[PDB]
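notes to self, project folder thing:

trying the whole complex as one job this time. last attempt i did each chain seperately and stitching them together was a nightmare. two parts in total, labels are on each line so i dont mix them up again. if this works i'll redo the older ones the same way
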Amino acid sequence: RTVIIRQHEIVLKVAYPQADSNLRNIVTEQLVALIDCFLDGYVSQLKSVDKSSNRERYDNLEMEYLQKRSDLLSPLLSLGQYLWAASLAEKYCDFDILVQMCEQTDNQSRLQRYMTQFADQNFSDFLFRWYLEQHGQLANFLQAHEHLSWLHEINSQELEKAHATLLGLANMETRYFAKKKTLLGLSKLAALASDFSEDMLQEKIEEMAEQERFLLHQETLPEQLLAEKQLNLSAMPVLTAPQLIGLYICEENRRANEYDFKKALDLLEYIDININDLKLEILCKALQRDNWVSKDSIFVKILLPEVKDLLQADEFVLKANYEYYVQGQI
Amino acid sequence: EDRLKIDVIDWLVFDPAQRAEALKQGNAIMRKFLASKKHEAAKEVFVKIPQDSIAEIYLPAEDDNAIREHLCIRAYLEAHETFNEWFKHMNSVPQKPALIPQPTFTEKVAHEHKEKKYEMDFGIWKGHLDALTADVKEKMYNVLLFVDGGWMVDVREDAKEDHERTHQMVLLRKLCLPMLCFLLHTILHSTGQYQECLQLADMVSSERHKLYLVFSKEELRKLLQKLRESSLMLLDQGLDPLGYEIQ
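result (full assembly):
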C-alpha cells in the first residue's frame, strides 16, 4: 500500500508529461507505464487466486477494487495508443469493457470479431455490453435478439415469426394498457401480412379476436369515472376482470346503464376467488341505482338459475319481476 | 373528354329541380377522376356544386348515399389540400448562414446577425409547421376514421343495384386508404411523432374499421417496414420500440 501508491503516482506523472513530449519519447514512457501496470495487475490476480471460498465477502470486495483500477488504467490508456490495449486487455486477460470500447470507437468490427473468436462467453458479454451503453446496426441486428426480436424479424421478412413474439410480448404486458393494445395490433398486422394458409390464418385471427374481446372492455370505460377516479388516459395499467367489474359498478360511475353491467357480467369468464358473491354484488347495485327499469333490461339482454333469491334479500317488485322471470325463462 | 364530363355538370346545376341528379352525377364524375388522382379535376367539379346543395335537396336510398359520398369526397380532397401546403412548407426550411472562413471583422459581425436571425426563422418554421401538422393530421383521421361506417361506404342499404358505383367505391378505398396511411406515417415521421406512428397499427388492424382488408399483403409489410423505422428513432431517444420509458 506504499509500493502500490508509488506506482499509481508515476502513472499519473507519466500522464502529465506526454502532454508535452516529442512523439517517440511519449511512446517509450507509455510502453513503460504499460510494462509496470502489467506487473501490478498480475500481483492482484495472483493474490486473488491465493484466497478463495469462506470469508468471500472480503474476496469480492477486493475484486471491485482491482476492477475499479483496470478501469482507471484503461481510461488513462483511452487517450494513449490502443496498440497497447490489446496487451493490457490480455495482461489482465479479461478487462473486456475497455478493449470492447476501443473496438467501438474505431471501425474495427474486425477486432470485436477477433475478440469474440478467442473468448469464453464474450458474446453473451458484448451484447449485454451494447445494450447497457450503421455497422452498429449489424450489431443491432444481433442485439435485437430478445424482445427486440420482432424488429429484426420484420426486417428478415420473417413475418410469421414476428407474429409469435409480438403476441408473446402482448401477453406478459401488464404495465401499460396503451402498449398491450399496440402490440396485438402489430402482431395481427404481422400475421395478416405473413404467409399462413387460409386455415392457420383463420386460427391466429380467431384466438386473436378473443384477446381484442377482453381488452375492448377496459377500452370502453366511461369518461365520467375516469376523470372522477383521476385516471391517466393511456398511461394506465392492464386491468384484470375483477378491477374492471368492480370499477364498472362503482358509485363513481354515475351514468351506469344496462351496458355497463351487461359487460360487468361478461367479465366473469375472465377470472381464474368467489364467483357467485360478485354475481350478487352487482345485481344489487343494479337495484340501488334503480331507485325503487335497468334490472328489467338486463334480464332482457341475457337471452337463468344464475341469479340468486332468498340469498338476495340478505321487495314488492323484486318478487313481482321474479314471476314474469319464471315465465320468460320458461 | 375531360371537359365533356365536367361540362355536363353546369347543365344539371342550372336547373335546381335536378340538384339530386346533379350531385349524384357529380359524384360519379369525381369517382373516375379520383381513381386517376386528378384532384384539380375533382375539385373544379366540386366547386360547380353550389355550396348550399345539401341543404335544399332535403330521402331515397340514392340520395342518402350521394350526400354521404359527396362529403366523403370532400373529406378526401381536404386531406390533400392541407398536405400539399404542409409538404410545400417542409421544403422551405430556413437555410443555415453561409460561412466565410478567415473573416474580416466586418464579415464577422454581419455573420453574428445572419446567424441570430436564422435562429429566429427556424423557430417559426417549426411554429408554422406544427400548426400545418396539427391540421393535416386531423384531416387524415377524418378520412381514415370516417364517421358512421367508414370512407366511401354506404350507410343506406336499400338502393337499387349499381355495380359500377359500388365496385368504384371498393376500389377507391383500396387506392386511397393505403395511400393516406402512408402519407400520415410520413407526416408523423417527418415531425418526429414516433410513438403515434406505431399507433397506426392499432388504427389499421382495428376491428372497428377493418382498414386492413383494404390493404394488399405487400402494402402491409411496407407499412411494417415503415413503423420499424419510426421505432428505431425511438430507441435512439432511449425509449422502448413503442415509445414507452424503459424502467
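what i see at first glance: The interface with chain A takes residues 198-199, 201-202, 204-207, 212, 217, 220-221, 223-225, 227-228, 231, 241-242, 244, 247 of chain B (CB under 8 Å).
need to look closer tmrw
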